[model samples]
Target: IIGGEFTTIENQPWFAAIYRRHRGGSVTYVCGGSLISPCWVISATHCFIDYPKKEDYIVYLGRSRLNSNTQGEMKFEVENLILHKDYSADTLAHHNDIALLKIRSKEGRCAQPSRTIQTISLPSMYNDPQFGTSCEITGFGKENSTDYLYPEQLKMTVVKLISHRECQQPHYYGSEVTTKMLCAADPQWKTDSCQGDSGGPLVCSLQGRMTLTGIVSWGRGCALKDKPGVYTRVSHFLPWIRSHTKE
Candidate 1:
């Protein structure tokens, strides 16, 4: 999270950190995700392109810091890696870029809810949050996309939903902006999701619940002028998500 404030898992209990496990026993944080159910997490499909194997990934719930374990962190191995059937990184400008990971422990345990580890509500499929509504994007992605560095802890910043009409201006993303995606940017352009934050949540508070509305997908560059971050509209995938909940 760039130009954002540090936050604890207690404030965003459904947040998850997806890690890539190398063959030699080392693990590295790769993307951000959110628990939608005890055994399932929703994330971006791009994050798994390079490592398609189930054993190549691990997940951390209740994690508040990076590099070292923090309070309430719980680790789990991925039981299944499910990518959208229509998603293809080779084309389509990231349409259907959403993904799901079913997690489990070696002892046959799935997520056990806690104050700092629980599920987030999914957006209603038929309704969309209006433009200009304030929402939060939380992550440990790079503060600067130009560099390889990222923050040592989870951070969050407020960003407003922008209309695709505004986002499609030639000065911004042009015609590449689609309704399947939602655009969000800090009004001051001081903060945005960068590398390492793919698949993270862009949640908006609705009816007393923090509802997941977007999944971090892509942007022209991090925090650049006039370039809003593009997210996979979660509302468009509601049925697909519901169908997988039984798995």
Candidate 2:
């Protein structure tokens, strides 16, 4: 999944971005996602199951700007939604917290193969020493913007993957943390994601191509130094994801 959109990239004219809407109406409910396959999007299960009705969501692709008055052209409706059976929002356990959405409809917009919503190949393992070596997070999330406001532009930040142990100290994230998740910095407290960045993708480049390793799951307040952001370990759910999608 894509990480929360950083407003800094909204007008840079170098990156591709998108915005999505749900069934109720044409309002924006921003969430992160990954193009895992040509027709599949991997995101947080909470995004779908938390809704009152399943058919309320629609995804827009090939958008470079946030304002409908400025950007957004190609769009499509989701054909199917498969949320992990183990998702729970009450306790926020969020185990097996991945979901896949199949875009049944098509938006034949012209874009660079890499510029259009593109699939990110899955890695074979989790927590590889190189997992957090260098990564980038992009999203339509809040930065220094006003409270409860979404950025009019997309923003991005460079992140360093850290170990769970390194992120969980009493003064930091507390001691009750799990190592199965991926930890990322909120850019030394200068940056962070609000509720809008959920389900976004945390991507790292390997051999010149970006590969998604984590999906935005949860995080403490924006950037609180010791308290880093947490993400769903994409590698851990590969089997269930593959079996559910079936190519």
Candidate 3:
């Protein structure tokens, strides 16, 4: 979040903190994630590709900050990690860059919604946010493109959806923008998701309730002009998600 404003988990309770758990029980923050259901969380495949083992990752719900905890955070063990079957590496950004995690509690139940924790709504297969729709992106990613430090607090910003035509302009990303991806950014390019924000949430709504719209996938640089952040448009993967999380 290059130009983010601090937010509360009460506001974005669906936000999940992903971490790489090492052999000694120490952990490293990996990427942002969204809790789509009590037992299911989703993030970018790019975040978990190298660390494919389900044992290697930990998912936390009801997190308000990334540094030290405040209260009511729930941790869960992963039951499965599913990356999109069509995902592939790329020079610009990858396609099908998403991953879904099925998690469980020690007692076998999943998350129970609370003041600091809750699940986000999944969009219907037909729900595709159109151009110029104002959306919100939230994460704990880096605050600057050149910085190595990740933010300690949850952060958010509003970015408008960018048309495929404008996003693929040669000066922008060119022909690489595919149907699997959607674009969004601040008009001034100052406010945007940054590194470590991958797999975070981008949400849209024309009415009252909002649905997950995008997963922070990639961008040339944090908050650069005309270089809109590319997201794994959630609407395209609703079936894939529903199929596995079904039972």
Candidate 4:
């Protein structure tokens, strides 16, 4: 599983504010997702499938910190979840690894029309990072495992993008990195997603608005130099996502 540690910075307030939990309980199992519609959440299929039933997960919105003591009132039980019919675990190949979740209707909370769930706008088209580009990532995982350091709030990091050829070097992801896929972030000593950040979003801001470029999928380890993280290229799945989710 892919995961990482994040620190809530005072400057990038929105990044920390958008981080959320899958279930309402402890924050042990963390995955990142985004509000693409008032009642829909886009996330990785792995986050919802722990067993035969999909009700095992809950969506916690409007929280900034992992250990938030504020006791957020905005919570929603999932009404429906649909993973791509052809997805398979053995191959580690995604038919369409994305899942759309329907949040149950509720009154007097963020689910309301005036204060309903927000949607993340998709990029108009794929923005390929040629050789040198930067992207941003947000998550609430461990800060550092060696010293057991965890962030008190959500965090964001910016990393220079790496090319497909360079990312496929033997010491890096090697053949596991596919042409259909693209890798982001310089593997040089820097912050990155790790173990608990399976379904988080990789974003880039353009014209003053942020757009999702990919979804966190897998990696060797968190923030390991020369080993870039793998992400589900959002651009490739735009058509499938729209047809299935009707968004």
lDDT of each: 0.88, 0.62, 0.88, 0.60
Pairs in clash, predicted candidate 3: none
Better of 2 and 4 by lDDT: 2
Over 1-247, each residue of candidate 1 has an lDDT whose tens digit, in order, gives 7788888889889999988888798888899999998899999988887678998888999999878897768899999999888876533257788999999987979999998998999888757788999999889888776668778879988999999899988898787778889999999999888878889999998767789999999887789899899999999888998888784
Name the TM-score of candidate 4: 0.77
Tens digits of per-residue lDDT for model 2, 186-242: 445655555666777777766666677777777766666666777788878878887
Superposed on all Cα atoms, the candidates' RMSDs to the truth, in angstroms, are: 1.5, 4.2, 1.2, 4.5
**TM-score of the candidate numbered 1?**
0.95
Give the per-residue lDDT digits (tens) of candidate 4, residues 136-195: 777665565453544566666776667888888888877777754557765565677765
Question: What tens digits encode model 3's per-residue C-alpha lDDT throughout 1-247?
Answer: 8886999999998999988888896888998899988889988898988879998887889888886876898888889999888888789878999889999987888999999988888887857778998999998888887888887888998999999889889999998898878999998887998888899999998457789988999998888888899999888888888887877
Which is the leading candidate under TM-score? 3
- As for model 3, its CA RMSD to the true structure in angstroms is 1.2
Give per-residue lDDT, candidate 3, residue 32: 88
The count of backbone overlaps in candidate 1 is: 0
Ranking of all candidate structures by their TM-score, best first: 3, 1, 2, 4
Show the lowest summed lDDT stretch of 10 residues, model 2: 9-18
